[PDB]
């Protein structure tokens, strides 16, 4: 139930896989934690607004259409999730 340290739920080799998909060849050790902070900022923003949606939707379950709203209000538009 109560969760504490999912900051390291992203593993470093997952980041290396993403970086090879991201075309990166040589990766510093300092990269992973900074990218962790960046992704935390991005998810805090979008999930905060998703919570705003769901309380405005008066629901205790989130929907992916809320996620569609969360991606569209900065134009990060994704297809195929009920849109």
């Amino acid at each position: 139930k109560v969760l504490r340290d999912n900051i390291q739920g992203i593993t470093k080799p997952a980041i290396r896989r993403l970086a090879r998909r991201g075309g990166v060849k040589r990766i510093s050790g300092l990269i992973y934690e900074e990218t962790r902070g960046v992704l935390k900022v991005f998810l805090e923003n979008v999930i905060r607004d998703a919570v705003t949606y769901t309380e405005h939707a008066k629901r205790k379950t989130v929907t992916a259409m809320d996620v569609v709203y969360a991606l569209k209000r900065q134009g990060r538009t994704l297809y195929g999730f009920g849109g």
Partner: protein
């Protein structure tokens, strides 16, 4: 001797492999746990459609690999092959974040 590929060969091979592949790379369960953790910061008593979670994973990964390619070309401009987070901060700030 036992064989050892020189550095960069294997890395470029995985670059080809994962530019070929389309799937999510982070394990879904710890990401889901992180989603629950972050959403708990705003309000308790929340359930989660799984479709929302995979949407978050795909959008997040696409966002990350896009900024990875951006920092990649930035480090290419900076005459390096080793990425350092100063490139990431420059890319965010010029991009506007």
């Amino acid at each position: 001797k036992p064989h050892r590929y020189r550095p960069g060969t294997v890395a470029l091979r995985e670059i080809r492999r994962y530019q070929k592949s389309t799937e999510l790379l982070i394990r879904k369960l710890p990401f889901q746990r992180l989603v629950r953790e972050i959403a708990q910061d705003f309000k308790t008593d929340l359930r989660f459609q799984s479709s929302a979670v995979m949407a978050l994973q795909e959008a997040s990964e696409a966002y990350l690999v896009g900024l990875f390619e951006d920092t990649n070309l930035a480090a290419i401009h900076a005459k390096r092959v080793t990425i350092m987070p100063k490139d990431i901060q420059l890319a965010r700030r010029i991009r506007g974040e």
